[PDB]
Design a protein around this ligand. Structure first.
Ligand SMILES: Cc1ncc(COP(=O)(O)O)c(/C=N/[C@@H](CO)C(=O)O)c1O
Ligand SMILES: O=P(O)(O)OCCNS(=O)(=O)c1ccc(OC(F)(F)F)cc1
Ligand SMILES: [Cl-]
Ligand SMILES: [Cl-]
Ligand SMILES: [Cl-]
Ligand SMILES: [Cl-]
Ligand SMILES: [Cs+]
Ligand SMILES: [Cs+]
Lengths: 396, 268
């Protein structure tokens, strides 16, 4: 039994070993309690503002839309401490850990952004932090690994399975199943077993809340659409949540199309996978015909979660939100375009969202539309990847 | 499930606990696995728990993680596992065969279809490791429709409501979990489970098998002495496989002596 519905329609649930159910229950109760507690809310707001630097700018991108009837704003989560949106909810989850008397943090990471966010929150708040990361990811994300270690976190390479994010997810739950009395599992996306999709949403919802107030102030009306990339779903739901009841506002989520949906080398399970049950939830999955879980492929490391948050699958099902894909090459163009036209280097993840907005604009250039793209991260981390591609293409 | 009822009745009559080994199907190959399983039975296994190789076995420690990887390396697929199961049942009419599954493999081709195939090959029970009692309804329904016992976990920190639920809904046996954490012989349970065993009996639960961390004869005896119907051992068995990959003969020899000793310990 729980306080809240673990499902969004048919999607979600609590598919963890029985041993972990008391952990999930405790977390749910503490969250429900925290949300009613003005002290908790005040401390969270204090960290968000004074440590992470909220509120974030909403930037109007005039150059990129010139000659069309598109107005485009970027929500600047790239300016957040840590350089991505991941920082928002780790601060809330660390406060919850403290609320519950936990003194240790477990986190998974793929690209390393969530690991870095977990590490910085843990350092600030005096929690001992261990991060699981697939050995292949450790190998290719040396800079992030070093950042985590500088901040005092233990980074544990995971060599089992495919040695990537899903494997790190497994390892985190295995650890938690034996350490939950003292450790909190700081899951890094709006996915996994209830209550994580709900908590991550509520601890990211300031993105959309701020966006709403900022767009009303600047434009005198709500956006025609808000657009966000979808790895596991946290930045997207963070942007969407405050607009769900504003049914005139389009909610568009962008999954990575990789080398092309038709190649099967992508990370777009919501639209092109198959519903499965894994990592604590019933959700669309990348999976073999045999039901073995597969990796998500994308040029962008952070869009590697091989499933998707259950709330997204639900919002899709009912037609409240629409989900699309953007390919590697589309994302790369959008990356280059923002650099040159706005002097902003976007994360390759969020470059997917930007790419779809540019498509909406270019396809129908005389359509009057007010769009917000969630710029969930900065792209400093991506310049080596971009360099190497451009070099191979003889663009440089 | 009726194989379990018959086993437990016969073991009760002989004043004995059940000794139940776990292996991963197809580890380290199909043929070798079949020989391994026949050896376990010949050496005195009372029932089997058999893992279907899965990409993400998140209730398993490294020993069994490695078993899954070895089976994958041999190219073992769920279809091949069903064929193995049919042959195992064809060879051994009465031994209860329980599967250790993860939810995705059960859900993959349809939950009903999964259990129907289980019935077709002669499986007796299914434990789905990542499905808690809270989520169990569609699995337990499909199981029972196909004459399959749904196996429920009774964690060492069960409250009374969980005990009553497991007692009502379970069949075959009740899995009495030794400790928190994941499978592995390198970690022994700490908590005495006598009280949980008593409460399960009060509620007419399926007989309890203790599992997790069981690697020694004394632990088998201890399970029986505490009132459980028997004990399951996985990692300890799989380690013998891992240890002896380079010597199939020595492997079977060591499996035989280990299983023989563990079964001997089940005598009250
Ligand atoms: C800069 C950036 N933007 C978007 C996403 C996508 O994450 P949501 O869908 O918003 O949850 C990520 C993810 N990164 C994870 C997984 O590799 C991680 O760091 O471990 C990211 O790092
Ligand atoms: O001897 P060990 O420590 O390897 O333990 C035996 C493991 N084999 S098993 O099939 O019984 C088994 C039973 C339950 C499991 O997970 C769950 F509890 F969450 F359901 C996993 C494996
Ligand atoms: Cl504001
Ligand atoms: Cl459109
Ligand atoms: Cl005991
Ligand atoms: Cl019963
Ligand atoms: Cs414009
Ligand atoms: Cs994805």
């Amino acid at each position: 039994t729980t306080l809240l519905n673990p499902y969004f329609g048919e999607f979600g649930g609590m598919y963890v070993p029985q041993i972990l159910m008391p952990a999930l229950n405790q977390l749910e109760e503490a969250f429900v309690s925290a949300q009613k507690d003005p002290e908790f809310q005040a401390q969270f707001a204090d960290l968000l503002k004074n440590y992470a630097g909220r509120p974030t700018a909403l930037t109007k991108c005039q150059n990129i839309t010139a000659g069309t009837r598109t107005t485009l704003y970027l929500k600047r989560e790239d300016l957040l401490h840590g350089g991505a949106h991941k920082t928002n909810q780790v601060l809330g989850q660390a406060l919850l850990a403290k609320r519950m008397g936990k003194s240790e943090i477990i986190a998974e990471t793929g690209a390393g952004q969530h690991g870095v966010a977990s590490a910085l929150a843990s350092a600030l708040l005096g929690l001992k932090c261990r991060i699981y990361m697939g050995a292949k990811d450790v190998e290719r994300q040396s800079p992030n690994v070093f950042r985590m270690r500088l901040m005092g976190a233990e980074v544990i390479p995971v060599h089992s399975g495919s040695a990537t994010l899903k494997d790190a997810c497994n390892e985190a739950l295995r650890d938690w199943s034996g350490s939950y009395e003292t450790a909190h599992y700081m899951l890094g996306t709006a996915a996994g077993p209830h209550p994580y999709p709900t908590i991550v949403r509520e601890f990211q919802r300031m993105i959309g809340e701020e966006t709403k107030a900022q767009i009303l102030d600047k434009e005198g009306r709500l956006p025609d659409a808000v657009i966000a990339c979808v790895g596991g779903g946290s930045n997207a739901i963070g942007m969407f949540a405050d607009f769900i009841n504003d049914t005139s506002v389009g909610l568009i989520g962008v999954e990575p199309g990789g080398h092309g949906i038709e190649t099967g080398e992508h990370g777009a399970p919501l639209k092109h996978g198959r519903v499965g049950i894994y990592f604590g939830m019933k959700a669309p999955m990348m999976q073999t015909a045999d039901g073995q879980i597969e990796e998500s492929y994308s040029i962008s490391a952070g869009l590697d979660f091989p499933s998707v948050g259950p709330q997204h699958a639900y919002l899709n099902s009912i037609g409240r939100a629409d989900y699309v894909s953007i390919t590697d090459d589309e994302a790369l163009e959008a990356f280059k375009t923002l650099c040159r036209h706005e002097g902003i280097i976007p994360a390759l993840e969020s470059s997917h969202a930007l790419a779809h907005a540019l498509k909406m604009m270019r396809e129908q250039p005389e359509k009057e539309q007010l769009l917000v793209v969630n710029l969930a991260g900065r792209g400093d981390k991506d310049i080596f990847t971009v360099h190497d591609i451009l070099k191979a293409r003889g663009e440089i | 499930m009726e194989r379990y009822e018959n086993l437990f009745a016969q073991l009760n009559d002989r004043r004995e606990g059940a000794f139940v080994p776990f292996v991963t199907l197809g580890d380290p190959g199909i043929e070798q696995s079949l020989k391994i399983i026949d050896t376990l039975i010949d050496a005195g296994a009372d029932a089997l728990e058999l893992g279907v190789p899965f990409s993400d076995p998140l209730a398993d420690g490294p020993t069994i993680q490695n078993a899954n990887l070895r089976a994958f390396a041999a190219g073992v697929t769920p279809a091949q596992c069903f064929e193995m199961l049919a042959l195992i049942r064809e060879k051994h009419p009465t031994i209860p065969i329980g599967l250790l599954m993860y939810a995705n493999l059960v859900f993959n081709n349809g939950i009903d279809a999964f259990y129907a195939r289980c019935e077709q090959v002669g499986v007796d029970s299914v434990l789905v490791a990542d499905v808690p009692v809270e989520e169990s309804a569609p699995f337990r329904q499909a199981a029972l429709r196909h004459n399959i016992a749904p196996i429920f976990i009774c964690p060492p920190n069960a409250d009374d409501d969980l005990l009553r639920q497991v007692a009502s809904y379970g069949r075959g046996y009740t899995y009495l979990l030794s400790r928190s954490g994941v499978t592995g012989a390198e970690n022994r349970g700490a908590l005495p489970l006598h009280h949980l065993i008593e409460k399960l009996k009060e509620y007419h639960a399926a007989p309890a098998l203790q599992g997790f961390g069981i690697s020694s004869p004394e632990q088998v005896s201890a399970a029986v002495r505490a009132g459980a119907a028997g004990a399951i051992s996985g990692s300890a068995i799989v380690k013998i496989i891992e240890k002896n990959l380079a010597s199939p003969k020595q492997m079977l020899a060591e499996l035989r002596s280990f299983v023989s000793a563990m079964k001997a310990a089940s005598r009250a």
